[PDB]
Structure formats: structure tokens, C-alpha cells
Amino acid sequence: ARAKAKTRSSRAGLQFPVGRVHRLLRKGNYSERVGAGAPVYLAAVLEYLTAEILELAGNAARDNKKTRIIPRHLQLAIRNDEELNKLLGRVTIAQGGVLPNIQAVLLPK
Amino acid sequence: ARAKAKTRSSRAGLQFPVGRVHRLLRKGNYSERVGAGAPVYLAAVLEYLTAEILELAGNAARDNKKTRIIPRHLQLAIRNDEELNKLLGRVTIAQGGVLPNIQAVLLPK
Amino acid sequence: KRSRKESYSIYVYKVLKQVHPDTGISSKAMGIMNSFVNDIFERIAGEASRLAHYNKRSTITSREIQTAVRLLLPGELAKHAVSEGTKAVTKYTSA
Amino acid sequence: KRSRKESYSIYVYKVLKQVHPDTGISSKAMGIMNSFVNDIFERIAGEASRLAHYNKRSTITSREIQTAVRLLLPGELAKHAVSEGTKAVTKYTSA
Amino acid sequence: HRKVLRDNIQGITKPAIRRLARRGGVKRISGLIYEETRGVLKVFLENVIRDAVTYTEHAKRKTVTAMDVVYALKRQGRTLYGFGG
Amino acid sequence: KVLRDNIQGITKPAIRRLARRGGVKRISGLIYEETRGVLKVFLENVIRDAVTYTEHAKRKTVTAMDVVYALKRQGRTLYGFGG
Amino acid sequence: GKREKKKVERLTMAQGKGQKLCEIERIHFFLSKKKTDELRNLHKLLYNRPGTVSSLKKNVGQFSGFPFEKGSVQYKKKEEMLKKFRNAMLKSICEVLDLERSGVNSELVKRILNFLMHPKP
Amino acid sequence: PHRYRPGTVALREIRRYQKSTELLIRKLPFQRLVREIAQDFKTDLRFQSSAVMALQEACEAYLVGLFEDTNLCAIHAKRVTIMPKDIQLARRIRGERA
Amino acid sequence: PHRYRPGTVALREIRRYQKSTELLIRKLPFQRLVREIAQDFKTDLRFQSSAVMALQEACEAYLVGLFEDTNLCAIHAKRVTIMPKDIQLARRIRGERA
DNA sequence: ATTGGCCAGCTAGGATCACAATCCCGGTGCCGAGGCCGCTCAATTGGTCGTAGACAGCTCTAGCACCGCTTAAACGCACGTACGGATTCCGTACGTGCGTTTAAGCGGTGCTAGAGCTGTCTACGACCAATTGAGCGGCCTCGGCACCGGGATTGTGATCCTAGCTGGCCAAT
DNA sequence: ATTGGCCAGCTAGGATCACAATCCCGGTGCCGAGGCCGCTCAATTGGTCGTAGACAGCTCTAGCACCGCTTAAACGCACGTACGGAATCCGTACGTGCGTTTAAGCGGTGCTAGAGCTGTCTACGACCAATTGAGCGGCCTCGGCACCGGGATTGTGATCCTAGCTGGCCAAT
């Protein structure tokens, strides 16, 4: 009489938990009522962004011949990508250091 | 059987409407529940700030020998007061213009 | 009879009379003050909201407003505002 | 048994396996991602909340998230994110 | 009904920029700066209008109301007082 | 106990290292007093906000979460501490 | 499809028709006998700008006259420097060039310049 | 015969346009500009006048502050003429970017 | 006998401290500083280590960005030595202020 | 043959003159600010319910304090190059002021899309209980990698060799 | 008989060498990343019920379009002078390196405040219904203020006057 419980996530084809998002939205009193598709869409968005970051960072890792992502590879990924750097420009990433930038003038001739 | 209705405002000794504040707080879904003293305190704060602004502006008006506050007076009041300028530093006041500031170097000698 | 839009004008005008009885105020100025009041209110209330979720707490009481104020207003404003608010809420509870 | 703190780590891990099967991730990185996800989520949700009060509307539906996204993410992110979200919610409604 | 208003940015004329600079306290201005500052401006307005029209599209209105513009600026971190914000 | 005059603990070479990370090649000996004063200011603000959250919670340990939230208020969000 | 990986953009900040003054042995003798600091006013006239006091002895000694012709705009530009000089320094410029030390200011201008158009022994 | 030494009238002009508040850009050209911009995001939009007016206040304020900062830079280089490298600098430091 | 021309080792140092991430300020002095500051707001405070660590990450990041901007200014004055007038400028433009 | 003074001429600074800009004083009218009125909706008042949160008590994590040893970093000094910054000069690119062109501003009319409100209704979400499997913590382990050491490469500064000019001696002059 | 070619000495550019900073490669041993398991509770599922928001229909405010005078502003060009910026040369302050001093870091131990949890209970706020008067919009009216004409004052630019210096000839040496 009871259909096999499958998480809304599965219904959506996402890795991020939709139900968790939903719960947070209602626990955040963002509005008295939260539509059903809102947590789905939101989860999808977050998932996408995460995917993007992790892709770039891992790329940068293969460039350091490093198999495992550490905070520097995130800093590199982000700052080297203009779109994210705009998104995360006010953000300081602990243990991230800086993007190597020696101003042209400073180099001797 | 019914006590003479006197606005909470009166009970507080404020000019800003406390009840209006209350209503907004609950209509803003800041939280499922809003304590009784919160709108009082908030109204008082707003009232104070308003009072401060108007005081300074009106001062500046008597310095322009102008009896009636216009946006320029507000701009003058705010920018000349450090504490507010810090509060309202990201704010652009329509019809406010600029605080007269000719950099020393620019003046001839 | 049409939808009527709430503002704060009349209260600002009362305040002003308490501060500068001889002085009036232009409509434009009033629009500035309306916007300003709304903005301050929004900042404080939003701060309170977040500072209450931060504590896994559900209710904004005088303590949250007070804290929010201290955070937002710099120095002398913070002091005087806090003091005044305390005074007012005291007087409210007394009656 | 004591109070357990929710994070997103495991999901980030799954995503990462989809993107770079050979690659792992340090705990510190995971703390970054947790914070990041939370921050993005907060920005979007808060935007949605305000954009819903703005319209005297009570409910955050796909439309509000979509709008909020468009506002926050600049350009190509906005486009791809919107498209993906639409896809996902479509797939959800279909089943 | 529908007319393209192309190449209208030159309407931000040289003397207008000169007046704005004077408001800034700028005493002396290169003659080449004007095309730069038009480009700057265009960028700014692009962003603002983007956000404004976004809001409008959400509200399903077809007219960007002042309330939209102010709210857009507010997100730009550049709050504007004096329009019902 | 009253800790006093600890700002000299931001020793000259440490400022030099931070500058190098900035890409600064040459540093006038006057920078040090300026950058200490700047830094003291910064801390004052951050710590005032953090302490204020602490006070509100009635905890007495300033907690990493409080620092992150303070920064978040300043527009200086910090990732990597449980934000 | 996938995004394109848009990279960030960052804000990053004279030997004309004469003999050389070293080949004109009397002028070479004067240029060797005077201190190098006397030559500055001559090199200013020769190039419309004096160079380093380290190179200044070379800069005057290697000069072999102007490529120009008298009455031309470059000749008028030499008259500008010579008219902005003063009679004592003009007579010193005459002396080191082996020119005779008499003349009114305008004669000193034209006589120095007529020589420096075609310097010869 | 009368001719102000260059930079005098300029200083008078500064004192004037700071004492004053009125809109420094002609309204109708700015309006047509705004519409030109909108034309890329949505076809046949309609703007309340008030909206345009708001946009103008914002735009003007932004540029004014930009020139203030730019001037600061320019003076700091011991120059007086502000140049594009000074604006680009101002923006780069504000965190606005090309 | 070996002696690097002034500014060489400096450039090597830059390449090093940018390739690296480790904390540039000694931890214990910074800690004692933080406590000194707190002493004005509340007596006998206790800081989780993590909190101190966070503050350090923040303060370092802030200063680093400050020097980046400052350097920009300094170069823009055709100088190379950054001077307090360049920091003050940077802050004034960021909207930080004295 | 040289040195000092005289007449004429020139240039700099302090002053004088003229004019425009700025300001100030007072009269004018006009329109937006400010007051009054009736209505209505939002604020207020009273009684009820429960549940959020204050408070107290317990556990034990983790923050504090302190010590000693090692050692890298900090400090202080000597030294010298490169740099900042002052100086000068030059070219021209700005600024300023004419006359001219032009399109901004204003007011008016006409048109109507579309803002805004209201009523219908129902698709959607809140709420509840019952279900359960996804997610958390603990633990175990095992590969990634930071470190070390040898070898290789590169980069930097130090050095030598040669080409050129200048000075002295012997031979030529 | 004296000094210009010959050789010797000095200097600058190219080539060369030393050597030490960086890189590359293997090996190694560490411990944090990652998997597994069992338990928990938040996610799921179905049903019910109110309810707010999509939708059509409406009225009309407000945006858009077009027109024609009236200026004010934008424009283009001439003229010139203050500026930017290339050159230059000084002092020196900031780097670099060395040797000595300091205390950061580790790690290890001991102590205890107070974080975090749970349980109690209770004041406080949500809620509802009834009440009502504060606040709104519409009308009106009238004083502040923009303006403008005439003076008065100041700031600017152009000009004159007083002063010191320079050149050729005459007088004295």
C-alpha cells in the first residue's frame, strides 16, 4: 500500500539533498510558505556551483601534479576564473594565500 | 469596563508609532514570534536617530539662514558629522549634491 | 477610495517640531526621511533576525534589538541610542 | 551520543567524484566548501525572501529562486545555473 | 512604435562630464578621458538596469517602476534615498 | 593580568613578509607604524563585533563562529571555520 | 553545454659639413684646457639640450657642425639660445671655438652660429 | 581686454557646482541613453519618469564619487590633470573592475 | 665573495611568499595582541584557539590586500617604495578612513 | 693695455587701476507646506492557551597557566647601491573665449497600453501520523605527500680577455 | 737636441667561471582521507483541509508620441600658457649580510571555568472578537523662498612706478 520511499533528490537527479534545503528554508522563516519546486531548484543551483568550483580546483590540482584538493587549489581556481572572482570577490579563503602577481614594473630589465 | 484606549506609544513616551513597528516586524517574517518590548525599543531607536539627523540639518539650515530643511541640508548635516557619515557612507541622497571640498593643492598661491 | 501607502511622515514632522519649533520641512526631505527610517529599521530588524537564528533562538526581545543596535551604530550613537531605548522600555514596563 | 552538527560534506564528495573520479579532497577544503555552499544558499534564500515580501507575496516558488539567481550570479553562471535548475525541476515534476 | 536608439551614448556630452568632474573638485581634465568615462558609465548603467529589469520581469510588470531601480541599487550596495525605498 | 604594549609583537619582519606576499618590493621604514595602527583599528572593529555577539549569547568564550559572523557583517566573509 | 573558462583581467601598471671640434686642434686644445663644466652652455647650443657632465667632453669634442643652412628654422632655433645667453659667456664660447672676442650681442649670435654651421681650422 | 588666467574660472566653476545641487546631465539625452541600454535586456520597456530620475541621481552620484577618488589619486601622483590611468586605478582599488 | 644586488633577493622572497600559504605572523604574539585588544571591551575573556586562528586569517588577508592596493598606488606614482601616504590613500579610496 | 663710471636701456616687484564676479538688501508672487475634517482601517483591550525560554544542575571539554629545550627568527650594526626627489627644460595639450549650430526644455494635445484593483476558485502547501533508510560517529586502514638527499639545471654576480685611449721612453725629429 | 710611435696602463663591453638557488627524481614513513557498520531521526508518504494566488474582467492613471518656439547649451576653432614629463644630479635611506640575542613553538602536565546538555515550570506572546480613534486624503489658504534690480565689496588681471643691473665709450690707470 506504500510506494517505495525514494528521496525527492532521486526524483530530481541531484546529489545535493533537496529535503535538507526545504527544511532549512522553512527553519529560516524566509516566508510563511515555501513552494515545492523551490528547494529542488535551489539544490540544483547549489549543486551546479559546487560542481563548477570542484572542477576548476581539480584542474588546477592536476597542474600542480597534486591529486588532492587543498585550500590553495580553491583559491587558484576561483581567482583565475573571472565569473567566480566576481561572485566571491569579497571572500577571504583561509589557508588560500594569494594568486602570484608580480607587477611588471617591479621586475628588473 | 473598558479602560481608555491609549496607544502603546504614549505608554512609551515616543513620537514614532510603536504599533506600526510591531506590525511591520510581524509582517516581515523576521521571526515567528516578536517580543513585546522589541517594537518599543526599536521605535525609540529610530526616533532618536531621526531626531539627531533633523537637529543637525536644522542647525545647518540656520547657518544658511534658511528656515526650511531641504535635501542639501541633510547632506551637509550627515557628511559633516563623522558618526553618521560612517553609518550612511554607502548612501546617495538625491538632490543632496556634495560637501564643498577643494583639495589644498588645487588652490593657487 | 484606493489602496493607501503607509509612510512615517507625520511622526517625523512631530519629532521635528520637538527639535526645532520654528522649522518646517519640504516634501522631498520627508521622502528622504521616510526612506532613511525604513532603511535603518530594515538594518536593525534584519540584524535582529539573523542574531536570533544564530542563537537557535526564536524570539526578538529587547536584548536582540539592543545588540543589533550596538553592532550597527558606531560609538556615540550606539551609546545614546541604547541608553534612550532602555529608558523608553523601562517607562513602558512601569505602566 | 551528543548533538550532531549538520554539514554538506558527503554531497560535495559525491559531486567531486562525478567531476574528477581520480581526485580526492582534504578536510580543510571540505570546510571551505561547507562554508561556501552555506553562504551561497543564504544569499539566494535571503534574496528570495526579500523579493517575495517586495511583491506582498508570501510564497517562495521556483520563480523567486530563479529571479534571485539571475540577480546574484553574474552572466554565464546565471545562464547555466538557471538552465540547469529549470531542467531539474522539470524532471521532478515529470515524475 | 519600436525604434532602435543606437549610438546615443555620445549624448553624455563632453561639457556634461566636465560639470560632473567640477562637482568632484577636478581642476584639469585630459581631453581623452571622456570616452573612457562614457565607457565606465555605460558599464554601471548596464549593471543597474540589469538588476532593475530582472525585478520587473519577476513582478510580471512591463514597466520598470522607480521602486525597482532603488531596489537594484540597494543590491549594488549603493542605497538611494528619496524615492520610496 | 593587564597585557600591555603587545602591538610591537607584530614585528617589523612579519610586516615585511606580509608585504612581500602583497608583491611589495621596497618598503619605507615609516610603513611599520602606519600598518600597526591600521591593524589595531581593524582588530578593534572585528573584536568589538565578535565580543558583542558573545555578550548577547552570554557565553564568555569568543568562538570562531563569532569572528566569522563579525567579518560577515563587515563584508569580509571568511570561509573555513564552520560558516 | 559546459561554460567557457573566462580568464580574469587585472590592472597592471651632430656631425654635419665641418671638421670635428677634436680634429680642429686649437678647439681641442681649448676643450682640453678648460674644466668640463664650461662646456654645458656649448652643448646646450649644439643639441638644444645639455647631456651628462660625464659625457659632456665627448658630446662637444665629437661635434662636426650643424647639417643645416643659415637663415633656416633650425638656425633661428640656434639664434634663440644665443640671444638668451649673455655677452660674457658668448665671448667664452667665441674663445674656446678660436673666434675673436669682440662684437655686439647680435654679432656674437650670428658669428658663433656661422662658424658652428661649418666649423673648420 | 580681459582674460582669466587658465585655472581661475575653473576654480570658480568648482565652487559653483558644489554649492549647487541641480542635475548636471541633461535629462532627455540621459533618458534616451537609459532606454538604449534597456533595449538589450527587454524589448519595448516602459519607464516611469520617476525611475529614470532615480537612475540619474544614482549615476551622477556614482560618477561624482569616482572623480573625487580619481582626483585624490591624481594629486597623489603630484599631477593635476586626471587621466584614464587614474580612473582605472580608482576602480581597481574600489574593487570595481574592467 | 657573493652579494646579491639590492632588489634581487627581494624578488626571490616575493615568489616564495606567494607560492606559499603558511601564516606570515608568529602565532603567539598575535594571540597576545588579540587578548590585549579584547581587554578593553570585556575583562577576563576566553578565546577558543580556533577563534584566534580565524582572526589571524582575516587580519593577514586584510593587510595583504591592503598592500596589493598600496603597491598599485605606489607604482602609479612611478615610485617603488610604498610610503604611508600610499596606504592612507588606499584606505581613503576603499572607503576605510582615518 | 687695463679698470671704473655714465647714459640709456632693460627687467622685477609693489603698487595702482579697472572691471567682473560675488554678495547683499529689499520687494514681489506663487505655489507647496501646513492646518482642518470625516472616515476608515489598524491599533488597542481583554481573556485564553502552551510553549519558548529562563533557570538550575550535571558533565566534561577545552581553555588557561606554567616549564624547559630547541632553535629559527628577531634584533642591531656596517656597508653601499639605488632610489626618491629636487631641479631644469621643452612641447603641446589643455583651457579660455569668440561665433555658430542644435536640440533641450517647455507646454499642449491625443492615444492607450498597461498599472492597479476586485472576485472566483482551486491547485497547492501546511499539518499530522506512520514509515524508514539516508546520514552521522567510531573505528580501521593505507595511499598521498611533505621531507630528505643526490644530481642537474638555471640564474646571478664575479671575474677575465680584448679593444680603445692616454701617458712615458727611446728614437726620431 | 726634443718628443711622437711603441709599449704600458686604464677603462668598457663581451665572454667566461663560480657557485648557489631552483628543480627534478627517487625513497620513506606519517597520518589524515576514505570506507565500513550500526544506530538514529529527519525525510518520505498518504490523507485532509484551509487558503492565498492565477486568472479574467474591469477602470483609468500615467506613459508614450508628436509639434512648435525659445532660448541655453553644445559645438568648433584660434590662441597661448601652464602643465606633464623627459632629462639630470644630489643625498641617503633602505636593503643585504653577518653575528649575536630573544622567545616562539613544542610537548607535557595540571587545574578548572564554563560550554553544552537536560529537566522544570512558567511568564510571555499568539490568537480572537469587539472596540475605536489615529492617520489618511482631499481642500484650502498663505508665508517662504526664488527671483531680480539696484547698489556695495572683493578678486582678478592689466598696468605704472621705483629700483638694480648691463653695455659701449670716455676718463684714469
Numbering used by the authors:
A (entry chain C), B (entry chain G): 10 to 118
C (entry chain H), D (entry chain D): 30 to 124
E (entry chain B): 18 to 102
F (entry chain F): 20 to 102
G (entry chain K): 56 to 68, 81 to 188
H (entry chain A), I (entry chain E): 38 to 135
Quoted passage from the original study:
Eukaryotic genomic DNA is folded into chromatin, in which the nucleosome is the basic unit. Here we identify DEK, whose function is unknown, as a nucleosome-binding protein. Cryo-electron microscopy structures of the DEK–nucleosome complexes reveal that DEK binds the nucleosome by its tripartite DNA-binding mode on the dyad and linker DNAs and interacts with the nucleosomal acidic patch by its newly identified histone-binding region. The DEK–nucleosome interaction mediates linker DNA reorientation and induces chromatin compaction, which may facilitate PRC2 activation.
Consistent with the gel mobility shift assay and the mass photometric analysis, we obtained two structures, the complex with two DEK molecules bound to the nucleosome (DEK2–nucleosome) and that with one DEK molecule bound to the nucleosome (DEK1–nucleosome), at 2.8-Å and 3.2-Å resolutions, respectively. We found that the linker DNAs are sharply bent in the DEK2–nucleosome complex and their orientations shift toward opposite sides compared to those in the free and H1–nucleosome complexes (side views). In contrast, the linker DNA orientation of the DEK1–nucleosome complex is intermediate between those of the H1–nucleosome and DEK2–nucleosome complexes.
